[PDB]
Amino acid sequence: SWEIDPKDLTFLKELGTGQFGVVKYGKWRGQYDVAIKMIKEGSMSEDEFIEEAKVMMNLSHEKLVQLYGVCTKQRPIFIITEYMANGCLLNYLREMRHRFQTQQLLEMCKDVCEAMEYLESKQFLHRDLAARNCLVNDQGVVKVSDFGLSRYVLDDEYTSSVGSKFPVRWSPPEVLMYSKFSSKSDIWAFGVLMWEIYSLGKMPYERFTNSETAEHIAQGLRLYRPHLASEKVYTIMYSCWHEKADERPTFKILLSNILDVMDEN
Ligand SMILES: Cc1c(-c2cc(Nc3cc4n(n3)CCN(C)C4)c(=O)[nH]n2)ccc(F)c1NC(=O)c1cc2ccccc2s1
């Protein structure tokens, strides 16, 4: 793993707080914009992360937010990642909702699908794919962030499927019932993400609690077609929600589907 020298980092702005604590905007060697997670003590399974971190850094794709390196020779540990000036996709959708053309929404889906096809090809699971875990750069390109980090979280409210922080609304039945994660559970989450994009950042299953969502999706309830989604687009997101995991498409198939819709428009 790339062990970055913390002396080369200059902190510039606070970017808020997440599951591992504070995140800052800064520069590396006075030139390159980076985001820096300062890992709060007790928030992460640190030895496990350090042992496994190289796999994450070796993931390289234009539509993945890069994990550049880490600083682990002191505490707190730092994770250094690609800076994205427009922040998370969820807030971006909500803040600009009167400015998007449908072509732009499809392009966001394409960006994410390309990243996920790459992760699939590396047999690497995201485990918490959602609009809140995608970021947007200064040119409006969407990239997938925080892939694989779910595994290292120490917070029972997040890791328990009945915890109030578990991403129930992005989870297929086999995750909720058996904790069976696979690229097919990432597929399900991607469908929900497509729904978030086309609804311009609405909360999935709003007004339902997490347990009500679980109960009802297990019985067949599915997210309705957003107004801005054509039937072709809805068919794509809906295909992600087959009850049986082996009936769900791969990200390669989804990408082909999305490209077909683009070529038709
Ligand atoms: C990714 C991120 C940023 C962030 C924000 C960026 N960009 C921007 C740009 C702006 N903002 N964020 C907010 C303020 N805006 C004015 C500009 C960026 O480039 N990288 N990271 C800032 C605060 C955060 F809380 C997070 N998310 C996390 O750390 C985590 C997500 C997950 C998911 C699963 C498991 C563990 C974790 S830990």
mmCIF file of C-alpha atoms and ligand atoms in Angstrom:
data_model
loop_
_atom_site.group_PDB
_atom_site.id
_atom_site.type_symbol
_atom_site.label_atom_id
_atom_site.label_comp_id
_atom_site.label_asym_id
_atom_site.label_seq_id
_atom_site.Cartn_x
_atom_site.Cartn_y
_atom_site.Cartn_z
ATOM 1 C CA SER A 1 0.000 0.000 0.000
ATOM 2 C CA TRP A 2 1.111 3.565 -0.713
ATOM 3 C CA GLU A 3 2.130 4.981 2.652
ATOM 4 C CA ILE A 4 1.778 8.717 2.139
ATOM 5 C CA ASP A 5 4.004 11.025 4.177
ATOM 6 C CA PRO A 6 1.639 13.142 6.303
ATOM 7 C CA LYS A 7 4.157 15.996 6.144
ATOM 8 C CA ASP A 8 3.134 16.265 2.469
ATOM 9 C CA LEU A 9 -0.494 17.023 3.385
ATOM 10 C CA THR A 10 -1.870 20.479 4.006
ATOM 11 C CA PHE A 11 -5.366 20.720 5.450
ATOM 12 C CA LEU A 12 -7.540 23.484 3.972
ATOM 13 C CA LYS A 13 -11.259 22.978 4.666
ATOM 14 C CA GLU A 14 -13.638 20.848 6.682
ATOM 15 C CA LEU A 15 -15.794 18.553 4.512
ATOM 16 C CA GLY A 16 -18.053 17.249 7.268
ATOM 17 C CA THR A 17 -18.298 13.981 9.147
ATOM 18 C CA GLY A 18 -19.030 10.411 8.168
ATOM 19 C CA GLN A 19 -18.977 6.907 9.577
ATOM 20 C CA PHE A 20 -15.257 7.185 10.404
ATOM 21 C CA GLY A 21 -15.372 10.767 11.690
ATOM 22 C CA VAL A 22 -14.019 13.965 10.195
ATOM 23 C CA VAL A 23 -13.094 14.394 6.549
ATOM 24 C CA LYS A 24 -11.052 17.339 5.261
ATOM 25 C CA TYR A 25 -10.141 18.904 1.935
ATOM 26 C CA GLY A 26 -6.412 19.492 1.500
ATOM 27 C CA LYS A 27 -3.485 19.406 -0.890
ATOM 28 C CA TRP A 28 -0.732 16.859 -1.420
ATOM 29 C CA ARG A 29 2.696 18.404 -2.044
ATOM 30 C CA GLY A 30 1.121 21.844 -2.373
ATOM 31 C CA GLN A 31 -0.498 21.043 -5.704
ATOM 32 C CA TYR A 32 -3.018 18.211 -5.823
ATOM 33 C CA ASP A 33 -6.484 18.433 -4.313
ATOM 34 C CA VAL A 34 -7.252 15.503 -2.001
ATOM 35 C CA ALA A 35 -9.821 14.462 0.543
ATOM 36 C CA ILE A 36 -8.497 13.118 3.822
ATOM 37 C CA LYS A 37 -10.453 10.904 6.188
ATOM 38 C CA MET A 38 -9.173 11.168 9.744
ATOM 39 C CA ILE A 39 -10.196 7.820 11.196
ATOM 40 C CA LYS A 40 -11.752 8.349 14.635
ATOM 41 C CA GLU A 41 -10.394 5.989 17.273
ATOM 42 C CA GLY A 42 -12.774 3.074 17.766
ATOM 43 C CA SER A 43 -14.696 3.680 14.538
ATOM 44 C CA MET A 44 -12.753 1.240 12.350
ATOM 45 C CA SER A 45 -11.319 -2.263 12.547
ATOM 46 C CA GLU A 46 -7.858 -0.843 11.954
ATOM 47 C CA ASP A 47 -5.565 -3.875 11.829
ATOM 48 C CA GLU A 48 -8.043 -5.564 9.498
ATOM 49 C CA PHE A 49 -8.135 -2.496 7.254
ATOM 50 C CA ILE A 50 -4.334 -2.138 7.199
ATOM 51 C CA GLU A 51 -3.948 -5.837 6.390
ATOM 52 C CA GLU A 52 -6.403 -5.562 3.476
ATOM 53 C CA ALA A 53 -5.954 -1.972 2.213
ATOM 54 C CA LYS A 54 -3.650 -2.696 -0.751
ATOM 55 C CA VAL A 55 -6.460 -4.468 -2.612
ATOM 56 C CA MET A 56 -8.492 -1.250 -2.472
ATOM 57 C CA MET A 57 -5.658 0.974 -3.697
ATOM 58 C CA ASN A 58 -5.024 -1.291 -6.700
ATOM 59 C CA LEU A 59 -8.506 -0.497 -7.958
ATOM 60 C CA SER A 60 -8.076 2.105 -10.691
ATOM 61 C CA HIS A 61 -10.785 3.457 -12.986
ATOM 62 C CA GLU A 62 -11.866 6.903 -14.211
ATOM 63 C CA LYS A 63 -15.327 6.429 -12.650
ATOM 64 C CA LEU A 64 -14.039 5.252 -9.263
ATOM 65 C CA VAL A 65 -13.028 7.841 -6.683
ATOM 66 C CA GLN A 66 -9.430 6.779 -6.176
ATOM 67 C CA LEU A 67 -8.075 5.644 -2.826
ATOM 68 C CA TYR A 68 -4.563 7.069 -3.308
ATOM 69 C CA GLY A 69 -2.928 5.953 -0.101
ATOM 70 C CA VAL A 70 -2.916 5.846 3.674
ATOM 71 C CA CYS A 71 -1.048 7.241 6.654
ATOM 72 C CA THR A 72 -0.775 4.569 9.320
ATOM 73 C CA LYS A 73 2.414 5.385 11.272
ATOM 74 C CA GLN A 74 0.456 7.361 13.859
ATOM 75 C CA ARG A 75 -3.105 7.712 15.104
ATOM 76 C CA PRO A 76 -5.521 8.719 13.884
ATOM 77 C CA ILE A 77 -4.854 6.960 10.607
ATOM 78 C CA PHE A 78 -5.599 8.882 7.408
ATOM 79 C CA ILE A 79 -7.155 7.672 4.177
ATOM 80 C CA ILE A 80 -6.242 9.919 1.226
ATOM 81 C CA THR A 81 -8.662 9.989 -1.697
ATOM 82 C CA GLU A 82 -9.546 11.802 -4.914
ATOM 83 C CA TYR A 83 -11.203 15.160 -4.240
ATOM 84 C CA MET A 84 -14.569 15.826 -5.883
ATOM 85 C CA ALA A 85 -15.553 19.489 -5.824
ATOM 86 C CA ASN A 86 -19.322 19.061 -6.111
ATOM 87 C CA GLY A 87 -19.632 16.645 -3.193
ATOM 88 C CA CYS A 88 -21.996 13.742 -2.852
ATOM 89 C CA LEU A 89 -24.402 12.862 -5.630
ATOM 90 C CA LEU A 90 -27.430 12.828 -3.305
ATOM 91 C CA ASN A 91 -27.041 16.485 -2.379
ATOM 92 C CA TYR A 92 -26.023 17.433 -5.909
ATOM 93 C CA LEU A 93 -29.275 15.988 -7.254
ATOM 94 C CA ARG A 94 -31.325 17.826 -4.626
ATOM 95 C CA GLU A 95 -29.556 21.171 -5.048
ATOM 96 C CA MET A 96 -29.794 21.293 -8.846
ATOM 97 C CA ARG A 97 -33.092 19.506 -9.362
ATOM 98 C CA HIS A 98 -34.512 22.240 -11.620
ATOM 99 C CA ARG A 99 -31.515 22.165 -13.971
ATOM 100 C CA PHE A 100 -31.156 18.552 -15.135
ATOM 101 C CA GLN A 101 -32.080 17.223 -18.552
ATOM 102 C CA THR A 102 -32.965 13.523 -18.726
ATOM 103 C CA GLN A 103 -29.906 12.898 -20.911
ATOM 104 C CA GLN A 104 -27.741 14.046 -17.998
ATOM 105 C CA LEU A 105 -29.488 11.640 -15.610
ATOM 106 C CA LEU A 106 -28.778 8.704 -17.927
ATOM 107 C CA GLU A 107 -25.138 9.763 -18.165
ATOM 108 C CA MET A 108 -24.894 9.677 -14.356
ATOM 109 C CA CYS A 109 -26.202 6.113 -14.440
ATOM 110 C CA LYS A 110 -23.649 5.248 -17.111
ATOM 111 C CA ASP A 111 -20.783 6.686 -15.034
ATOM 112 C CA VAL A 112 -21.772 4.603 -12.023
ATOM 113 C CA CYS A 113 -22.393 1.480 -14.081
ATOM 114 C CA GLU A 114 -18.929 1.731 -15.633
ATOM 115 C CA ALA A 115 -17.322 1.895 -12.194
ATOM 116 C CA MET A 116 -19.388 -1.044 -10.969
ATOM 117 C CA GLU A 117 -18.591 -3.136 -14.057
ATOM 118 C CA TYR A 118 -14.938 -2.566 -13.234
ATOM 119 C CA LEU A 119 -15.400 -3.606 -9.583
ATOM 120 C CA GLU A 120 -17.367 -6.667 -10.719
ATOM 121 C CA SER A 121 -14.479 -7.627 -13.027
ATOM 122 C CA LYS A 122 -12.148 -7.498 -10.017
ATOM 123 C CA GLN A 123 -14.574 -9.526 -7.860
ATOM 124 C CA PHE A 124 -14.706 -6.606 -5.452
ATOM 125 C CA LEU A 125 -17.897 -5.734 -3.580
ATOM 126 C CA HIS A 126 -18.944 -2.187 -2.792
ATOM 127 C CA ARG A 127 -21.449 -3.228 -0.085
ATOM 128 C CA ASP A 128 -22.907 0.265 0.411
ATOM 129 C CA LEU A 129 -23.690 1.635 -3.039
ATOM 130 C CA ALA A 130 -26.127 4.584 -2.908
ATOM 131 C CA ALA A 131 -26.251 8.177 -4.131
ATOM 132 C CA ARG A 132 -24.803 9.321 -0.783
ATOM 133 C CA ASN A 133 -21.705 7.228 -1.632
ATOM 134 C CA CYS A 134 -21.116 8.666 -5.073
ATOM 135 C CA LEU A 135 -19.305 11.951 -5.598
ATOM 136 C CA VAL A 136 -19.446 14.559 -8.349
ATOM 137 C CA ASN A 137 -16.502 16.508 -9.728
ATOM 138 C CA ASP A 138 -16.286 20.069 -11.055
ATOM 139 C CA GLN A 139 -17.248 18.883 -14.537
ATOM 140 C CA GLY A 140 -20.301 16.942 -13.407
ATOM 141 C CA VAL A 141 -18.769 13.471 -13.747
ATOM 142 C CA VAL A 142 -20.166 11.032 -11.188
ATOM 143 C CA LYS A 143 -17.807 8.562 -9.526
ATOM 144 C CA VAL A 144 -18.333 5.743 -7.028
ATOM 145 C CA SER A 145 -16.835 6.349 -3.566
ATOM 146 C CA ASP A 146 -16.020 4.370 -0.397
ATOM 147 C CA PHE A 147 -16.223 0.957 -2.094
ATOM 148 C CA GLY A 148 -15.489 -1.866 0.338
ATOM 149 C CA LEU A 149 -15.184 0.366 3.402
ATOM 150 C CA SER A 150 -18.438 -0.949 4.904
ATOM 151 C CA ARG A 151 -16.523 -4.058 6.005
ATOM 152 C CA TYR A 152 -14.331 -2.103 8.433
ATOM 153 C CA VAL A 153 -17.022 -0.127 10.254
ATOM 154 C CA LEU A 154 -17.378 -0.659 13.997
ATOM 155 C CA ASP A 155 -20.890 0.524 14.810
ATOM 156 C CA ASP A 156 -23.572 -2.013 15.654
ATOM 157 C CA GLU A 157 -26.326 0.330 14.456
ATOM 158 C CA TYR A 158 -24.739 0.167 10.992
ATOM 159 C CA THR A 159 -23.556 -3.457 10.799
ATOM 160 C CA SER A 160 -26.746 -5.080 12.178
ATOM 161 C CA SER A 161 -29.515 -5.501 9.601
ATOM 162 C CA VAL A 162 -31.985 -4.297 12.246
ATOM 163 C CA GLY A 163 -29.795 -1.337 13.214
ATOM 164 C CA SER A 164 -31.071 2.163 12.518
ATOM 165 C CA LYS A 165 -28.106 2.959 10.257
ATOM 166 C CA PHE A 166 -28.078 -0.228 8.146
ATOM 167 C CA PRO A 167 -28.739 0.559 4.456
ATOM 168 C CA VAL A 168 -31.967 -1.436 4.363
ATOM 169 C CA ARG A 169 -33.467 0.607 1.524
ATOM 170 C CA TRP A 170 -30.578 -0.387 -0.794
ATOM 171 C CA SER A 171 -30.507 -4.076 0.248
ATOM 172 C CA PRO A 172 -31.881 -7.185 -1.499
ATOM 173 C CA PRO A 173 -33.802 -9.887 0.399
ATOM 174 C CA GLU A 174 -30.790 -12.211 0.703
ATOM 175 C CA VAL A 175 -28.791 -9.501 2.482
ATOM 176 C CA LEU A 176 -31.629 -8.657 4.860
ATOM 177 C CA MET A 177 -32.310 -12.356 5.595
ATOM 178 C CA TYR A 178 -28.887 -14.016 5.361
ATOM 179 C CA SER A 179 -26.207 -11.322 5.116
ATOM 180 C CA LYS A 180 -25.359 -12.828 1.737
ATOM 181 C CA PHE A 181 -23.380 -10.145 -0.109
ATOM 182 C CA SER A 182 -22.324 -10.613 -3.712
ATOM 183 C CA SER A 183 -22.048 -8.601 -6.881
ATOM 184 C CA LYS A 184 -25.784 -9.329 -7.157
ATOM 185 C CA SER A 185 -26.466 -7.394 -3.955
ATOM 186 C CA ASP A 186 -24.505 -4.501 -5.476
ATOM 187 C CA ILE A 187 -26.776 -4.881 -8.548
ATOM 188 C CA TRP A 188 -29.865 -4.434 -6.395
ATOM 189 C CA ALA A 189 -28.363 -1.325 -4.785
ATOM 190 C CA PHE A 190 -27.491 0.059 -8.220
ATOM 191 C CA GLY A 191 -31.157 -0.204 -9.246
ATOM 192 C CA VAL A 192 -32.114 1.820 -6.172
ATOM 193 C CA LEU A 193 -29.382 4.317 -7.065
ATOM 194 C CA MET A 194 -30.866 4.660 -10.573
ATOM 195 C CA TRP A 195 -34.181 5.384 -8.863
ATOM 196 C CA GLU A 196 -32.521 8.032 -6.659
ATOM 197 C CA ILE A 197 -31.060 9.661 -9.761
ATOM 198 C CA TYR A 198 -34.330 9.736 -11.715
ATOM 199 C CA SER A 199 -36.319 10.943 -8.705
ATOM 200 C CA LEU A 200 -33.754 13.741 -8.225
ATOM 201 C CA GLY A 201 -32.696 12.530 -4.801
ATOM 202 C CA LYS A 202 -35.886 11.395 -3.099
ATOM 203 C CA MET A 203 -35.589 8.946 -0.220
ATOM 204 C CA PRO A 204 -36.508 5.394 -1.321
ATOM 205 C CA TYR A 205 -39.639 4.065 0.419
ATOM 206 C CA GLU A 206 -40.107 7.385 2.221
ATOM 207 C CA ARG A 207 -42.669 7.141 5.053
ATOM 208 C CA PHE A 208 -41.920 3.408 5.478
ATOM 209 C CA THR A 209 -39.639 2.444 8.367
ATOM 210 C CA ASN A 210 -36.650 0.194 7.698
ATOM 211 C CA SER A 211 -38.518 -2.870 8.976
ATOM 212 C CA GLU A 212 -41.621 -2.012 6.947
ATOM 213 C CA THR A 213 -39.417 -1.651 3.869
ATOM 214 C CA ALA A 214 -37.837 -5.052 4.531
ATOM 215 C CA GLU A 215 -41.204 -6.690 5.137
ATOM 216 C CA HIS A 216 -42.771 -5.234 2.035
ATOM 217 C CA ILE A 217 -39.917 -5.723 -0.427
ATOM 218 C CA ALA A 218 -39.634 -9.341 0.751
ATOM 219 C CA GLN A 219 -43.307 -9.654 -0.255
ATOM 220 C CA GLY A 220 -42.716 -8.067 -3.667
ATOM 221 C CA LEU A 221 -43.167 -4.303 -3.246
ATOM 222 C CA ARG A 222 -40.964 -2.322 -5.653
ATOM 223 C CA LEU A 223 -40.114 1.342 -6.149
ATOM 224 C CA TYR A 224 -42.495 3.106 -8.552
ATOM 225 C CA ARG A 225 -41.322 4.591 -11.858
ATOM 226 C CA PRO A 226 -40.078 8.155 -11.362
ATOM 227 C CA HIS A 227 -41.725 10.751 -13.607
ATOM 228 C CA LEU A 228 -38.466 11.498 -15.422
ATOM 229 C CA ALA A 229 -37.680 7.845 -16.197
ATOM 230 C CA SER A 230 -38.835 6.486 -19.547
ATOM 231 C CA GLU A 231 -40.217 2.968 -19.606
ATOM 232 C CA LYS A 232 -36.945 1.772 -21.171
ATOM 233 C CA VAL A 233 -34.998 3.297 -18.286
ATOM 234 C CA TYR A 234 -37.412 1.894 -15.710
ATOM 235 C CA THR A 235 -37.075 -1.578 -17.208
ATOM 236 C CA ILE A 236 -33.324 -1.350 -16.588
ATOM 237 C CA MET A 237 -33.594 -0.328 -12.921
ATOM 238 C CA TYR A 238 -36.427 -2.817 -12.336
ATOM 239 C CA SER A 239 -34.287 -5.680 -13.666
ATOM 240 C CA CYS A 240 -31.964 -5.106 -10.693
ATOM 241 C CA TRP A 241 -34.716 -6.079 -8.263
ATOM 242 C CA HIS A 242 -35.420 -9.711 -9.149
ATOM 243 C CA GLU A 243 -36.179 -11.569 -5.919
ATOM 244 C CA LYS A 244 -33.741 -14.302 -6.946
ATOM 245 C CA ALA A 245 -30.146 -13.077 -7.176
ATOM 246 C CA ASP A 246 -29.241 -15.305 -10.131
ATOM 247 C CA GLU A 247 -32.002 -13.688 -12.202
ATOM 248 C CA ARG A 248 -30.432 -10.236 -11.837
ATOM 249 C CA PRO A 249 -28.216 -8.935 -14.643
ATOM 250 C CA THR A 250 -24.469 -8.351 -14.359
ATOM 251 C CA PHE A 251 -23.047 -4.837 -14.536
ATOM 252 C CA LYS A 252 -21.725 -5.693 -18.002
ATOM 253 C CA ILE A 253 -25.288 -6.384 -19.174
ATOM 254 C CA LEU A 254 -26.600 -3.241 -17.462
ATOM 255 C CA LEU A 255 -23.944 -1.107 -19.134
ATOM 256 C CA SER A 256 -24.925 -2.547 -22.510
ATOM 257 C CA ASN A 257 -28.573 -1.794 -21.742
ATOM 258 C CA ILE A 258 -27.785 1.802 -20.791
ATOM 259 C CA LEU A 259 -25.648 2.332 -23.892
ATOM 260 C CA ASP A 260 -28.456 0.942 -26.067
ATOM 261 C CA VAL A 261 -30.874 3.521 -24.661
ATOM 262 C CA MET A 262 -28.319 6.262 -25.266
ATOM 263 C CA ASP A 263 -27.746 5.210 -28.884
ATOM 264 C CA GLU A 264 -31.509 5.211 -29.442
ATOM 265 C CA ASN A 265 -32.020 8.737 -28.095
HETATM 266 C C1 LIG B 1 -16.831 10.725 1.196
HETATM 267 C C2 LIG B 1 -17.072 11.732 2.283
HETATM 268 C C3 LIG B 1 -16.697 13.076 2.150
HETATM 269 C C4 LIG B 1 -16.036 13.581 0.920
HETATM 270 C C5 LIG B 1 -16.471 14.779 0.307
HETATM 271 C C6 LIG B 1 -15.846 15.216 -0.831
HETATM 272 N N1 LIG B 1 -16.161 16.366 -1.557
HETATM 273 C C7 LIG B 1 -16.923 17.436 -1.110
HETATM 274 C C8 LIG B 1 -16.974 18.712 -1.710
HETATM 275 C C9 LIG B 1 -17.828 19.450 -0.979
HETATM 276 N N2 LIG B 1 -18.292 18.675 0.029
HETATM 277 N N3 LIG B 1 -17.722 17.423 -0.075
HETATM 278 C C10 LIG B 1 -19.240 19.115 1.048
HETATM 279 C C11 LIG B 1 -19.136 20.643 1.112
HETATM 280 N N4 LIG B 1 -19.322 21.216 -0.230
HETATM 281 C C12 LIG B 1 -19.498 22.673 -0.142
HETATM 282 C C13 LIG B 1 -18.237 20.889 -1.181
HETATM 283 C C14 LIG B 1 -14.784 14.451 -1.366
HETATM 284 O O1 LIG B 1 -14.213 14.795 -2.398
HETATM 285 N N5 LIG B 1 -14.403 13.335 -0.752
HETATM 286 N N6 LIG B 1 -15.030 12.910 0.418
HETATM 287 C C15 LIG B 1 -16.965 13.974 3.172
HETATM 288 C C16 LIG B 1 -17.592 13.541 4.327
HETATM 289 C C17 LIG B 1 -17.961 12.224 4.449
HETATM 290 F F1 LIG B 1 -18.577 11.811 5.583
HETATM 291 C C18 LIG B 1 -17.714 11.313 3.441
HETATM 292 N N7 LIG B 1 -18.089 9.961 3.564
HETATM 293 C C19 LIG B 1 -17.419 9.141 4.382
HETATM 294 O O2 LIG B 1 -16.449 9.543 4.996
HETATM 295 C C20 LIG B 1 -17.771 7.720 4.485
HETATM 296 C C21 LIG B 1 -18.632 7.015 3.734
HETATM 297 C C22 LIG B 1 -18.714 5.643 4.059
HETATM 298 C C23 LIG B 1 -19.517 4.621 3.491
HETATM 299 C C24 LIG B 1 -19.451 3.342 3.958
HETATM 300 C C25 LIG B 1 -18.580 3.005 4.991
HETATM 301 C C26 LIG B 1 -17.793 3.967 5.562
HETATM 302 C C27 LIG B 1 -17.852 5.283 5.100
HETATM 303 S S1 LIG B 1 -16.954 6.689 5.638
#
